[PDB]
Every structure is written in structure tokens, then in C-alpha cells.
Amino acid sequence: VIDPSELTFVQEIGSGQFGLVHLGYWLNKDKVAIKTIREGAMSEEDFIEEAEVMMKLSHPKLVQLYGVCLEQAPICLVFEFMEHGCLSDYLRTQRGLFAAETLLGMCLDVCEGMAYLEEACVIHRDLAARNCLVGENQVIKVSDFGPVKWASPEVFSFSRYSSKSDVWSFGVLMWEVFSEGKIPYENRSNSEVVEDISTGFRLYKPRLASTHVYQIMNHCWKERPEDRPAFSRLLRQLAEIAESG
């Protein structure tokens, strides 16, 4: 479902060399988030690809995408518009006012999301506070799919992702969720961070984090893949804890 220039570029909200995020309007009817590319950033085909599979997957937790502008000029990707930035930022401000049944009432949102792609046998190579999004009321959807801090042991040394490679990045994020948006492994050098975790150093327990929460966080940070859960199981797991304390 390719789109033409029926979009009204209003503002920008996110930089980096691979797409400037541009809030605009299509048909004026819907609010959207338009991510443009550049000029040398990615092949036509190259980018055609990823776009093709993002239209394949669809879940009330994954940022729904709208149309595309292969119609020459700034070839961009137009997704719906999440009314509340990225979990990251959203977690920064608003800080405090967050209760626990809710911080947990997001994690699953991410999770639900990730079990799908987990099964969609799709490896989101960057699951983080900074990639997920907040929208139509506490509802949390994931995007930018298709940073050693969030990586796992088999990504530093090998770069051997495996869906379970994420399960960890899902952890670090989780951490964030709870530590209301704090950078994990700060007073630490990437070229240090590793060691710390290499020995066996996990992120301290963020206050809001519960005793049974920290149980998972580590299930996410188990050193060996094989013994790290599966998003599929996690969902059942977080479903449990979301039921009590």
C-alpha cells in the first residue's frame, strides 16, 4: 500500500542518519509519524525489503504502519502516530507518579509485542526503552525493529543474536521501565561494562522493582541463552506477577 505526497510535513521529532522522524498529516484525516531516509543511507531494494516484512507482522503492540513514499523524493515510511513519545522519554518526565501494577502494565505490552515477533521468528535487533512507544492510554507498542548496554554476552564477543539475545535487552529495558527511565551501566565504560557483567554483575534492583520482578530481570540476564525464558513463557510469567505483588 504505497503512498504518494498526500502528506503534510509539520514537524520533526527524532534524528540520526537513517531517517529523520517527521510528524505530519495524511489526507489531513489521520495523525501520523513519517520517517524519511536520506540519500546514501540505504539501497532502494535494501529498504524495500525491511518495509515489506513490517507489513507482514501486525499486533496491537507493534506500531501500526501506514503507507510508504517510494514515489521518489524523500522516500519515507509513515506509521501511525504514538501520542506520547518513546517509553524512554515518557519515563523520564512524569517520573514518580508511577505506581507498580502499571509499570508492569507496560512490560507485558512490550512483551506481548515481542512474543509475536519472537514467534514471527523475527529478531528485533534493538529492543529498548528508546525504541518502544507510548500511545492511546498506557498502551505500549514497539517499533524501529526489522548499544552493548542492552546487548547480551553472545553479542559483545560474537554478535550472535537469537531472539533470546533480545530477551536480555528486554531485561535491561524492563530495568528502565522500573527505574523510571534511567540509563543502566552509566558510570561505566562500554569497554568495562562488559567485564562487570562478564564476572556476573547485573543491574541493582530499582526500588519500584519487586522481589519477584528482580526474579525475571535475571532470568533475562542469565548468562547462558538456553536457560533464559522465551517471550512466550514470560508473558505467562508477567501475567502471574501482574496479579498480586
Brief summary of the model shown:
The protein has 245 residues and is an alpha+beta fold. The chain is built from 8 helices and 8 strands, in the order βββαβββααββααααα.
Annotated CATH architecture of the largest domain: Orthogonal Bundle
What is the CATH class name of the largest domain? Answer: Mainly Alpha
Strand content: 5-15%
Indicate how many domains the architecture comprises. Answer: 2
Alpha carbon gap, first and last residue: 45 Å
Number of strand elements:
8
> What percent of the residues sit in helical stretches (DSSP H or I)?
25-40%
CATH superfamily of the largest domain: Transferase(Phosphotransferase) domain 1
Number of helices: 8
Largest sheet: 5 strands, antiparallel
Write the H/E string, N to C: EEEHEEEHHEEHHHHH
Query: How would you sum up the global shape?
Result: globular
Q: CATH topology of the largest domain, which one? A: Transferase(Phosphotransferase), domain 1
* Class of secondary structure makeup: alpha+beta
Key features?
five-stranded antiparallel β-sheet, Phosphorylase Kinase, domain 1, transferase, alpha+beta, Tyrosine-protein kinase ITK/TSK
3D architecture notes:
By secondary structure, the chain is α+β, with helices and mostly antiparallel strands. The protein has 2 domains: about 1-85, Phosphorylase Kinase, domain 1 (2-Layer Sandwich); about 85-245, Transferase(Phosphotransferase) domain 1 (Transferase(Phosphotransferase), domain 1), CATH 1.10.510.10. About 35% of the residues lie in helices and about 15% in strands. The chain is built from 8 helices and 8 strands. It has helices spanning about 45-55, 85-90, 100-120, 155, 165-180, 190-200, 215-220, 230-240; strands spanning about 10, 20-25, 30-35, 65-70, 75-80, 85, 130-135, 140. The chain has a 5-stranded antiparallel beta sheet, with no helix packed on it. A 3-stranded antiparallel beta sheet has the order 6-7-8. Strand 7 and strand 8 (about 140) form a beta hairpin. The chain is globular, with a radius of gyration of 18 Å. It starts with 10 loop residues before the first strand and ends with a helix.
